[PDB]
Amino acid sequence: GSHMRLSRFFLPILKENPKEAEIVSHRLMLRAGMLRQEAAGIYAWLPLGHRVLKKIEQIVREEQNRAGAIELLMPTLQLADLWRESGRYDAYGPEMLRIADRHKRELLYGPTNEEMITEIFRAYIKSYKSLPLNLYHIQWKFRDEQRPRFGVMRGREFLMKDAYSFDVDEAGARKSYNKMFVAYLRTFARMGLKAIPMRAETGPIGGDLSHEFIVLAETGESGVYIDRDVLNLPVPDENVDYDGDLTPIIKQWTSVYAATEDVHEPARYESEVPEANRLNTRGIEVGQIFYFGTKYSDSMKANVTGPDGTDAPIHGGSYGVGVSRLLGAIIEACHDDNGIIWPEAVAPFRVTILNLKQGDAATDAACDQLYRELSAKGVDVLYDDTDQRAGAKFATADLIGIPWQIHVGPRGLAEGKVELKRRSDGARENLALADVVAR
Amino acid sequence: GSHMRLSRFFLPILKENPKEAEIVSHRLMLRAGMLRQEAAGIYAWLPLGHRVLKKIEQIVREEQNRAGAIELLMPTLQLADLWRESGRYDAYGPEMLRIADRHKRELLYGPTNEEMITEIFRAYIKSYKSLPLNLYHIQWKFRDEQRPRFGVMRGREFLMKDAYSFDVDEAGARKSYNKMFVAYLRTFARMGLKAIPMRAETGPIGGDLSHEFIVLAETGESGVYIDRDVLNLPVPDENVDYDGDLTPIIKQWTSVYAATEDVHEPARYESEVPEANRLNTRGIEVGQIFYFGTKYSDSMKANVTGPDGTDAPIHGGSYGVGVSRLLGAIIEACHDDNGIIWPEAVAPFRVTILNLKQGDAATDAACDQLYRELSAKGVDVLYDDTDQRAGAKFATADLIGIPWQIHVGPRGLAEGKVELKRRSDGARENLALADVVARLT
Ligand SMILES: Nc1ncnc2c1ncn2[C@@H]1O[C@H](COS(=O)(=O)NC(=O)[C@@H]2CCCN2)[C@@H](O)[C@H]1O
Numbered sequence: 001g002s003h004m005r006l007s008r009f010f011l012p013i014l015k016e017n018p019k020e021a022e023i024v025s026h027r028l029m030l031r032a033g034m035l036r037q038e039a040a041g042i043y044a045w046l047p048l049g050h051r052v053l054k055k056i057e058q059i060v061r062e063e064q065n066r067a068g069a070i071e072l073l074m075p076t077l078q079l080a081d082l083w084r085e086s087g088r089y090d091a092y093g094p095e096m097l098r099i100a101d102r103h104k105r106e107l108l109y110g111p112t113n114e115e116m117i118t119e120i121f122r123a124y125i126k127s128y129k130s131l132p133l134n135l136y137h138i139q140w141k142f143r144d145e146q147r148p149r150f151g152v153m154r155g156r157e158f159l160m161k162d163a164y165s166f167d168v169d170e171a172g173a174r175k176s177y178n179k180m181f182v183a184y185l186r187t188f189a190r191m192g193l194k195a196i197p198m199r200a201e202t203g204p205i206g207g208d209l210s211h212e213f214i215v216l217a218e219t220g221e222s223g224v225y226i227d228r229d230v231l232n233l234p235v236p237d238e239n240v241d242y243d244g245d246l247t248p249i250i251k252q253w254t255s256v257y258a259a260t261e262d263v264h265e266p267a268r269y270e271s272e273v274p275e276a277n278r279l280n281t282r283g284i285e286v287g288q289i290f291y292f293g294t295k296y297s298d299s300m301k302a303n304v305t306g307p308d309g310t311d312a313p314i315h316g317g318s319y320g321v322g323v324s325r326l327l328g329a330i331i332e333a334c335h336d337d338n339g340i341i342w343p344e345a346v347a348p349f350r351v352t353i354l355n356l357k358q359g360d361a362a363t364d365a366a367c368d369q370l371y372r373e374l375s376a377k378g379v380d381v382l383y384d385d386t387d388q389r390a391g392a393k394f395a396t397a398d399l400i401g402i403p404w405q406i407h408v409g410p411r412g413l414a415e416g417k418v419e420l421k422r423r424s425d426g427a428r429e430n431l432a433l434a435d436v437v438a439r
Numbered sequence: 440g441s442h443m444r445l446s447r448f449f450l451p452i453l454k455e456n457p458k459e460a461e462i463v464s465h466r467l468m469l470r471a472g473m474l475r476q477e478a479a480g481i482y483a484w485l486p487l488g489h490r491v492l493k494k495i496e497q498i499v500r501e502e503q504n505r506a507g508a509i510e511l512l513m514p515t516l517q518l519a520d521l522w523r524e525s526g527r528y529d530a531y532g533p534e535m536l537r538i539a540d541r542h543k544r545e546l547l548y549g550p551t552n553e554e555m556i557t558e559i560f561r562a563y564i565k566s567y568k569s570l571p572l573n574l575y576h577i578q579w580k581f582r583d584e585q586r587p588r589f590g591v592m593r594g595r596e597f598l599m600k601d602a603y604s605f606d607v608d609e610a611g612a613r614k615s616y617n618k619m620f621v622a623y624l625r626t627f628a629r630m631g632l633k634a635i636p637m638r639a640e641t642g643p644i645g646g647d648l649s650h651e652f653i654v655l656a657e658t659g660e661s662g663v664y665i666d667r668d669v670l671n672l673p674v675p676d677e678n679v680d681y682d683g684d685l686t687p688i689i690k691q692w693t694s695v696y697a698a699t700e701d702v703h704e705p706a707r708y709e710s711e712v713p714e715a716n717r718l719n720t721r722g723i724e725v726g727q728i729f730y731f732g733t734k735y736s737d738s739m740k741a742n743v744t745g746p747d748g749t750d751a752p753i754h755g756g757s758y759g760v761g762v763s764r765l766l767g768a769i770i771e772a773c774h775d776d777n778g779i780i781w782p783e784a785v786a787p788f789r790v791t792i793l794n795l796k797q798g799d800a801a802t803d804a805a806c807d808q809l810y811r812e813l814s815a816k817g818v819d820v821l822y823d824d825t826d827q828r829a830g831a832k833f834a835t836a837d838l839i840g841i842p843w844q845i846h847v848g849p850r851g852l853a854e855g856k857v858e859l860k861r862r863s864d865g866a867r868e869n870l871a872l873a874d875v876v877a878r879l880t
Contacts, residue, residue, distance in 0.1 A: 009509060038516075038517070042516050044514060051510075071486060073492075097541075116483070120485075124451035140579070142516070144540050
């Protein structure tokens with residue numbers, strides 16, 4: 001289990017708030033040594049930030065696999081011609097970064113991957129028997145956003161797990177859509193986020209199949225109207241049967257009202273949601289599921305032979321989690337006046353060890369000992385071993401958001417004890433040096 | 440320990456050799472449904488392909504960390520203005536993908552990251568007390584290779600681990616370089632490769648101190664000139680002391696003449712080598728290390744305060760490993776007439792269970808249990824539960840090159856036994872359905 005010492009690390013703390021940051025999470029990612037802007041909307045992820053980014057990446061992956069989706073990797077650069085096949089090339093917009101290689105071939109930095117995935121599908125898959133199929137990757141995208149803004153939350157280069165489903169009819173597709181809906185409730189739950197499924201902007205297709213998963217915040221960009229009972233709903237444990245019928249679970253979440261400003265009916269809101277249960281607020285879109293049937297398979301001629309032996313365009317859906325952007329949501333949703341409060345499951349380190357008289361023989365040895373014992377039992381452990389006063393060490397440990405602190409000085413070591421602090425709520429428990437490892 | 444059922448999976452095996460694939464590594468990867476060409480030298484990585492690539496990435500990550508380097512991540516898109524600071528803008532020449540954004544801003548797709556990493560460093564580091572510092576990331580890169588070729592070996596969108604050291608003076612840089620040198624020996628060895636550190640030139644990267652780690656091979660774009668002695672030297676174990684004097688190991692590995700063709704000189708060669716060992720020959724370059732002194736720190740004003748209270752530019756070096764290229768190079772060094780033979784460390788799965796009569800409940804259940812137990816016992820396992828017949832399952836499982844096959848069927852199963860094939864060499868073996876798992880764990 002990974003383990004670092006600050007004096008061997010790279011963690012550039014900024015004492016003061018950077019002018020260029022408006023919302024709290026940007027403001028905090030910069031001070032917490034997690035980020036550097038390289039161009040507008042384009043970020044280097046500094047060591048601490050990358051660790052968090054990796055953890056979010058892993059969780060998202062685990063839930064995709066748990067739901068049966070298969071991981072591959074598509075390239076950043078796509079041919080224009082591919083996009084011409086589907087009629088999105090000129091249609092997508094100026095946010096698509098266009099590139100010309102040395103041979104004047106037209107490529108773009110992919111903002112997304114429907115055409116590409118379809119291309120891949122039609123090259124290999126021929127019979128209804130291979131389906132359902134859910135193919136996904138976690139990969140960098142570009143949208144030449146008009147005003148790159150809010151640090152990681154409206155950037156231009158950004159990390160997204162995008163998933164793509166392939167079914168025989170609308171029936172199978174809605175089944176695949178359920179699978180991802182469930183996978184998503186779990187995903188966000190595992191990140192200490194209550195993200196709410198909300199019916200969101202459908203295309204010319206109509207119907208019900210489109211949901212944005214939204215975390216609530218007054219700082220947020222998307223506006224919402226919700227029946228508060230939805231904040232209390234339970235999130236399927238890890239044993240959910242994904243070959244089964246999730247309609248129950250889906251009904252449990254769609255039954256109660258949930259909508260964004262785009263598809264909101266005042267006349268239906270008033271008809272379903274009791275006066276006191278209503279809440280008009282805003283939120284942060286962290287995930288997005290969208291069923292698009294034969295939109296791509298038509299133009300691209302991605303067909304399979306049905307269970308009656310005739311060729312049909314496949315029905316598909318796509319499912320995106322804003323991986324890089326979660327970093328910004330998680331912090332908005334998890335901070336206080338002292339800085340970040342990482343949920344355990346996404347923190348860059350589980351515990352930091354703080355030396356309150358660094359250089360003194362006895363405490364230095366106790367730190368080493370805990371450093372090494374916590375290391376051996378697969379715990380992510382930073383040991384702040386810098387030549388710096390307790391006060392400085394607290395402000396940083398608190399700033400960077402590590403879930404547990406361990407305070408170690410000659411004081412407590414006198415009666416053979418260390419202070420353990422739980423960041424989220426300030427809980428503290430002066431403890432015996434020999435017990436703390438027992439978590 | 441990852442587990443998968445080939446019915447659950449996505450693996451598009453090709454029957455014929457692809458006409459486009461000039462060399463084996465390329466041929467095989469397409470055939471073994473690992474890769475797909477999306478553009479000239481730009482590749483999609485299919486599930487199996489991805490999995491290997493992510494194991495390669497991991498072995499490299501581990502060995503970098505063990506050598507004291509610190510992982511971050513820089514973006515794929517860099518500012519041309521940045522490349523103007525150091526000169527390099529007009530000195531990658533045509534292999535640099537230039538991009539204009541919607542606001543007409545000169546961006547490029549980074550082929551490498553010397554200036555950006557320096558940009559970062561100078562922003563935050565001002566004291567010698569902070570060095571040695573080694574920062575690295577594993578990130579996608581683009582070189583507009585004029586004629587993309589040999590699949591993943593000479594493409595355009597490739598994946599590299601590039602790390603960048605920072606020290607007060609040259610002496611420091613040397614220590615830092617030796618660290619990376621030693622980390623490289625382990626990295627490649629851990630992949631079952633014999634990459635030979637040979638002297639090299641630095642080209643656009645810069646510096647007069649450089650080695651390339653080159654894996655010997657016939658179908659390899661690299662002209663090497665090594666004294667064969669060089670070839671069975673000891674690879675330092677997992678417990679090498681990175682803060683201790685690494686000199687002895689570097690010397691061991693550089694006392695013998697070893698040059699790429701760019702630096703090869705023929706006087707020396709003979710008058711330093713046994714004629715019988717002298718072997719001119721081809722190889723693949725899987726990694727390269729350079730010390731470029733104050734190249735970027737000068738032109739970019741990346742200074743630190745030294746011991747004598749004075750300010751002086753830092754001494755840098757960079758270190759790259761062709762992550763995506765390693766797939767290609769591994770196969771070339773590990774194949775036979777029937778397909779890939781994956782070294783254990785980098786295999787997509789450790790063992791595959793081949794079911795030789797799909798639908799018969801007797802073998803099915805016997806397989807399932809074996810599937811489920813090998814999982815729990817922490818091991819990459821693949822179950823071929825397809826509608827396919829033994830012949831086909833043999834050919835496929837041979838192809839994708841899993842180190843171990845498990846042949847389950849009612850012939851051996853009557854005797855409550857199964858066959859175990861080491862893909863490595865074909866060695867076979869019947870043993871009880873029990874004492875099998877324990878022999879892989
Ligand atoms: N087009 C390519 N396709 C696949 N792999 C490639 C490609 N170019 C470089 N490589 C791989 O990267 C390793 C190092 O490359 S290098 O020698 O040019 N070095 C550099 O670019 C320095 C070192 C890292 C960052 N800057 C090389 O050893 C090689 O394995």
